[PDB]
Swiss-Prot record, chain B:
It comes from the Viruses. Forms an icosahedral capsid of pseudo T=3 symmetry with capsid proteins VP2 and VP3. The capsid is 300 Angstroms in diameter, composed of 60 copies of each capsid protein and enclosing the viral positive strand RNA genome. This is Capsid protein VP3. Interacts with capsid protein VP0 and capsid protein VP1 to form heterotrimeric protomers. Five protomers subsequently associate to form pentamers which serve as building blocks for the capsid. Interacts with capsid protein VP4 in the mature capsid. Interacts with protein 2C; this interaction may be important for virion morphogenesis. It is found in: Virion; Host cytoplasm. The lineage of its organism: Viruses, Riboviria, Orthornavirae, Pisuviricota, Pisoniviricetes.
Swiss-Prot record, chains H, I, J:
It is found in: Virion. This is Capsid protein VP4. It comes from the Viruses. Interacts with capsid protein VP1 and capsid protein VP3. Coiled coil: none annotated. Myristoylation is required during RNA encapsidation and formation of the mature virus particle. Lies on the inner surface of the capsid shell. After binding to the host receptor, the capsid undergoes conformational changes. Capsid protein VP4 is released, Capsid protein VP1 N-terminus is externalized, and together, they shape a pore in the host membrane through which the viral genome is translocated into the host cell cytoplasm.
Amino acid sequence: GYSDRVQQITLGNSTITTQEAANAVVCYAEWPEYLPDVDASDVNKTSKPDTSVCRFYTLDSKTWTTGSKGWCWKLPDALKDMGVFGQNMFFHSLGRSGYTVHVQCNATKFHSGCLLVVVIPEHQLASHEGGNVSVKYTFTHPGERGIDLSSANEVGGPVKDVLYNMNGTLLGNLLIFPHQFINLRTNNTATIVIPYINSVPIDSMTRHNNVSLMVIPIAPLTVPTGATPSLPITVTIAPMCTEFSGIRSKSIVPQ
Amino acid sequence: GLPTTTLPGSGQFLTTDDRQSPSALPNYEPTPRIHIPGKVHNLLEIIQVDTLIPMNNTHTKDEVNSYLIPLNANRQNEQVFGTNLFIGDGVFKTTLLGEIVQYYTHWSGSLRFSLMYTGPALSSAKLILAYTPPGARGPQDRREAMLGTHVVWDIGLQSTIVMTIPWTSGVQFRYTDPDTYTSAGFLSCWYQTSLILPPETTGQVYLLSFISACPDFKLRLMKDTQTISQTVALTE
Amino acid sequence: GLPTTTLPGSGQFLTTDDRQSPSALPNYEPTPRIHIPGKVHNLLEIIQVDTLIPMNNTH
Amino acid sequence: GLPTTTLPGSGQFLTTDDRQSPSALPNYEPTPRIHIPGKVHNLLEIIQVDTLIPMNNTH
Amino acid sequence: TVASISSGPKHTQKVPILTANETGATMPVLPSDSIETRTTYMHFNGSETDVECFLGRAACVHVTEIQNKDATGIDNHREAKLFNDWKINLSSLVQLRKKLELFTYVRFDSEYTILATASQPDSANYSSNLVVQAMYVPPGAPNPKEWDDYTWQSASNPSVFFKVGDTSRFSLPYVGLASAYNCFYDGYSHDDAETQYGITVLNHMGSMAFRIVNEHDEHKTLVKIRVYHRAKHVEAWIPRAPRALPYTSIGRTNYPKNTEPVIKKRKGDIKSY
Amino acid sequence: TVASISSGPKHTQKVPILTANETGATMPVLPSDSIETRTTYMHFNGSETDVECFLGRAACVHVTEIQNKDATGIDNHREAKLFNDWKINLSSLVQLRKKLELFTYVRFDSEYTILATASQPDSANYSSNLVVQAMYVPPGAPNPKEWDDYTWQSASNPSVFFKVGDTSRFSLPYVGLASAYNCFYDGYSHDDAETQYGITVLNHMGSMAFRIVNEHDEHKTLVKIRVYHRAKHVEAWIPRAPRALPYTSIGRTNYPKNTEPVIKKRKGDIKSY
Amino acid sequence: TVASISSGPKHTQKVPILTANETGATMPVLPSDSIETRTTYMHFNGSETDVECFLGR
Amino acid sequence: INYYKDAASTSSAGQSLSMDPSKFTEPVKDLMLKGAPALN
Amino acid sequence: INYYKDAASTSSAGQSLSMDPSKFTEPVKDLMLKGAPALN
Amino acid sequence: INYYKDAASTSSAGQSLSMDPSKFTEPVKDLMLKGAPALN
């Protein structure tokens, strides 16, 4: 009586149940694991807070309306302030982590709409100015708020044009990245497990984000007659196999 | 001193030849490799992942909406969409498949075309997808369409339908850039019965459509893509 | 570095010589051969089929 | 005469390449080596000896 | 290898063509799941789509130019193109760039070919024969200031001398600092509020300085340098969506404003053929 | 091997010299069936009549020309012969063409040799040294528009750079779409009422674009390109009647009107010697 | 080859970090004598610092 | 025959002949069998 | 010795030494023997 | 393969792979053990 459909994920002191899942994706078919010695470089023993950092943090909720263009969060940024995960983050020189991402959106059998939930490794954004204008730090570190693709261009911020993925590629091809759809008629959640993907064994958690999670409405939300025209979307994310190394004074970052 | 003779071609530089060269950095030790998920070995590995087709090309500036094929409730007998199968041009051209095919001169193989339905769960519909092999015109009505490769799709719990365009061909390779002799057919879709919405519901519903290549597929003779060009060198 | 000497004829192009060359299309896979009746191997095979002589050349 | 083809790079001088050359002094016999304390083999051997840092740079 | 097996009529409870794309998978459906097929063999291996093959041919990566002329009274050799440097890149001419950016991280050895040809746009009695010097200048080395500085001694820095009209060729190991070169980097060099975004040393491949060794003749001679780059021993990770809009800058993803629709509009209906 | 066996007088009921040609056969009659012969050996193998040998020597297949000159103010490089393309063919110069069309389908690898020589028809101080670039442009690739377009980057398209006066040589595998190249095709590309007859992609071998890499000197330089083609690994099917009338077009069988009698008229009678 | 071995807390009478530089020696002290380390390998030979290489271009 | 000492100086590598699209085409956590229902 | 990797790059092929004119000189359905009458 | 007769004409030497810093880092007459007191 197991269905692909019902699932339970327990991680730390927190549990999620979905009764309307559509399997789960594990990026590149690899599950998060700690850093092996053969791959290690820094000689420091690392710190593995385990259950105090590897639990589920639910970010603040978004509201899908007929005019929504899509939202974008960066990792580990989105979690920069969650509990002890965040403290560890500002206090060590280097850290490394994988995540379980669970995006939630329920409706009824009269609604229609379909969101794309995708994880993009190394999502370098484009400046809407063109040329070689850079995208300032603050703009690519929105924190739990994430970036709202239907917000206005700002100065020093990225471009927010959806048919171009914020980088000069077409929305249609985002499907080459680990992703899952939430089609109100099928699905009510999306779950993706992200292994740590980098060109170095461990890195800085503040100067470099290693994935952007993106939720994009593709088939517009259509509510039943005289229904309220909107649904909330909630994102809950859990660091998994986290390791921190090179402890010290506590980083100070712009803004 | 051993006697030699040099042949025609001596001193030429062929950008495609593969020979040994002296290393400028004798004895240098590269950084160790660490493990990174995701290694690609063949472009054939990636063109099997499906991506969305902007089938609804009828707009005037690129929009999220050209990915949406609309469906109308209560129409009978009528046609949902049509396209030829020049995978290197037209709707296909910006898709990952289209985009890679363009790095090669010839392609052969089967294509997989699927449609995912997004209408309310309490609605229902039966569509027919038809592949018309080279030699006939794009079908003009379902009767015409239904006499070639087709699948009656019944919209249900299972949200997507995967149609295969089996390789139908005299010549074993076709050109990726559209060519007549080498042309592959048409793909059309019609109401088999009709879309029906539940009460309290209204308007258009949309289908999303994807394209990817079957394991069947072959691409050969690499060349340059018409999809990118430039007028002055870029700088930092 | 192995010492060499080049002989007279170096650099010439003789349309009748038969040597190796780099392939411009590295790794390309040609279309499979299928069977076709009629293969010719030697011109000596075909000059044994008789053909008509315009003997009455007087026109 | 063996047929050859020369590749791009022929005739270049790369200061870092390592090949054989004719000796200008054929048959010459170098002076014998005697023992000298102190032979260095790697620069890695010497950067492990500590030396003083002008830390007080303020002059 | 069979490309298609033989398959006949089906009337089952087992439907391989109905799936749920919401899952993120592309189910491996074949012609034989939905029509009746006959056996056929592949006759093909997919040799020429190997990434080593795809990135393994020489591409032009840079065209520069230097001139041989009397430097007498020139206050700025660099500025007179008496000599010229180039910080190595693979993202300035777009053909090879789009190919590499199909991947996120890439690792390979480089083989460089340098072609140099001379031009004499104004009245010369003859064509002189110039020798070019290409010096590889790694970050931290003294940089040439005049066309005949002590720098050109290049006692520790690899340099090649070849003749204009000829070609020089050598190969450099993978010089990246990390395990792969980042084709993309969503980071900064430090948490500064104004530091540059995206451009990184993670990509840095050295830099190269060119000059003519010859002193000047009576006329002036323009020498134009073309650098070609061929990847050998390629390793690529994490495929990405191909580049759709035009490029504007080395190292940023930025596209131009008021660009044009990249998807071709139908001449007709959705229903059109 | 015996070329003739010994044979003596015959008075038989078994007549090998009477046959019925209406049958379509050429009965294998020998000297020894009708005169008295002596033994003789062949001393010969028929080596030089092998089709590999017959089609295996280089033949000139194309002569084109490009010039190096100041492109300043040229509105159409292609038109100034600043650069030039060629869609590969073996039926434009007739010598090799008649040889190939002795067969219906032919399959082979090609070895190309390209000789380039320069001419300076009007007053020059000297002869410059130019490097030619020959790019192989398969159907669907961007085609060069100016003599120095992004196209020439040729990041994915095989190109060779050699010097004028020298020769370039490389070999291309059999690039046909079918199992053989059609020397003839009695068809159309589709059932159109006005589509072209006979000319087909079944024959298509690619296409090639040439340019000089050098910028301009003070004089102008004419470079004339000659492409030679040698078939290697030849396979030929279905012999046909040799070409009798002159050729008029690449790819059609058409002969010129009011052509001349191709059979030599006797100077005398049928009875004449 | 290990570049660093794994080493944990220490509370000893054996102090490798106190020395007398007046002796002229450079005592071979390592990270693992004064912090807690994890194993890591060298992945490197020191090839390009050989004097033959240094003076050989 | 390599004429040179360093590995970077050798010619192009030889075909992976690796090929496994499943990391890209089927990265699902619970295995999907073709023919069995997608969602149970 | 081939110096190159691809087959197209090898020299000319070597003599068929196949030679069988009968597909061209005697494509008759019922075999004709020299010496026996052509038409029986 | 050496093509030449004299030893000077051969290419560069090959890595010492000798490496022993103690003549430079620990030339003390009485051996010092790390961890034992420097001056007893």
